[PDB]
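User: My advisor, Dr. K., asked me to get a structural model of this assembly before our group meeting. I'm new to this, so sorry if the format is off. These are the inputs:
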Amino acid sequence: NRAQKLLHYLGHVMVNGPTTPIPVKASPSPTDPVVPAVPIGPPPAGFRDILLREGPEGFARAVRNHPGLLLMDTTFRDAHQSLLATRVRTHDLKKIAPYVAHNFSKLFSMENWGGATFDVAMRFLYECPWRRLQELRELIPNIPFQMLLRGANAVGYTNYPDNVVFKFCEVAKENGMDVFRVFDSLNYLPNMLLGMEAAGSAGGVVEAAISYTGDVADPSRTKYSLQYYMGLAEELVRAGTHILCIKDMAGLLKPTACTMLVSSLRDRFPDLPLHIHTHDTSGAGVAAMLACAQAGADVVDVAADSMSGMTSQPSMGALVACTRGTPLDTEVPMERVFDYSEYWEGARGLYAAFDCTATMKSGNSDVYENEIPGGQYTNLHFQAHSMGLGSKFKEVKKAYVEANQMLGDLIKVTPSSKIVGDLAQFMVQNGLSRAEAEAQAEELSFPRSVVEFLQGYIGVPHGGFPEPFRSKVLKDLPRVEGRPGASLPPLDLQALEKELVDRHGEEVTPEDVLSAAMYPDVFAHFKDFTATFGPLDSLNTRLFLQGPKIAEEFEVELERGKTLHIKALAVSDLNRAGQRQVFFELNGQLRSILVKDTQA
Amino acid sequence: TRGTPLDTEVPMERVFDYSEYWEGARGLYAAFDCTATMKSGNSDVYENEIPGGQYTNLHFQAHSMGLGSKFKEVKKAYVEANQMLGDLIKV
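Assistant: The format is fine. Below is the predicted structure of the whole assembly, which you can bring to the meeting.
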């Protein structure tokens, strides 16, 4: 039934390995983290109260006129991709919410979702991000929430019908999501326009970001000029925004660049709040970060110190220590930060089998010449080292820049980063050179992602795309021009709902429908896997990944009344055809279950 | 130090290949390493005043014998121990 389901799952776990590959021969350490104590009464006041009480622009004016500085935490989304394979369960995260709210109250809001919030939580993690965000609201009625959003594509890598994004924003407002970060990988203006328009139409604060690239301090850089960025900012604010941001996954924000860009932003709008978000990858996050904070910055994005350094965002403890005897007046009890960071350090030791510190043990430099996203850099290095790519993985990264150059130097975050990635992968695995690729490419085959990009689904960049290569490779394929969202006919989601109901549903809800609208195959895989092995989100980290050691007693809580105690007794051996018998002990019941081995 | 009068003027390409070489040679001594034990550079170095060359083997011992939760008590009385020996400049 239900308990027998999870027992079957545990048997499969013990006999086999985990479904997700384990690239590195390592096991979780036997050191559990320590939870500091907090009171039971209501938490101190943050900024969610202002939104629940005042209009959004009134809140923005209050923030702009608020004396000092503010932080907006990000320890749920970006540190995952920057450091791990974005493989941190909600079980570890359902133990901090009482601590932070009852202690921290000056935080602006929280970042929960982002780029790798669905795929990894649908491919290698068997959880539901909808259910992940649904119950996070009841524990923090103190600090609002924000997600990272992609404009043209709703949550995927290719453009989708606009009304899909409309329902996306509507349900995001309905469930408890508070703030949006509207942004698209390229500078295709209609993408940002549609994203902000949908965010406003759904009803809620619209916060926009602009990707930054290159050295804005050098006049030699011309493709993304100085006045280019201010023109973009002016036209978007003319379209109507609440807070402006300068997006940096590459972490190339420089102090002189910092001060000049912040000054330029501040002249024409010393009225709207300025937002910033970056990755302390090269190791220069804090310095230029505080330069921007001193100059004109208002909202700051930071994660915990245990997931700091390396490639992720700057630590909150360092800035609080530096900006305490400062007019910005952080003025938050900073001793609690010690125990919070130490809790997270204790919790980090579990996922030692996968991390960016697997082989590259130190922080990532050379992003100033690689301009690869850190959240994607860690994933690339992880998968390559899983494939045993060592020093030869150096050239795997090397082919990326020429792929960009042949495709034209364009800004890349969600889709285009992956497109250049697998394009360079193919380009280098064929052992190809640039001269012949430019000369002869029509006969040369390419991955379907290259063709999809060349068709024009993502959109036209600022600098355009070369005509000869697309003409040679595309042959006579149809070409999509303008906004593909308008070009793509709107599709009825009611029929998809009926299809999913007829497949496995009778009370299913539309959030499942849109999660399938990500990709139906992964949704079907997840649905069958859950309908086979049992309900998740009651199992520990090492229990999920490594498994319970023999003769070890454990407790798992799923419902309000169903309490159970489990201890592992023993396992049988290969009898005739990989059939094993396992004996488990419940609180008062003891049963033996057969499990099917597959290595024969 | 690029648009500043400090004028580092160091060829910044060879620094890269130096970095990857030193990453390669660092992995040779992979049996014991600070990063392997302590995952990332951390705060709380303020009230501890640990010398740089001592925190390594100190946390080494702490997590080698499993004093993850007992390491905080080591630094809890560290200030009091020093003040018993008098507030001292220590190397």
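One thing worth pointing out at the meeting: Chain A has 27 helices and twelve strands.

User: Perfect, thanks a lot.
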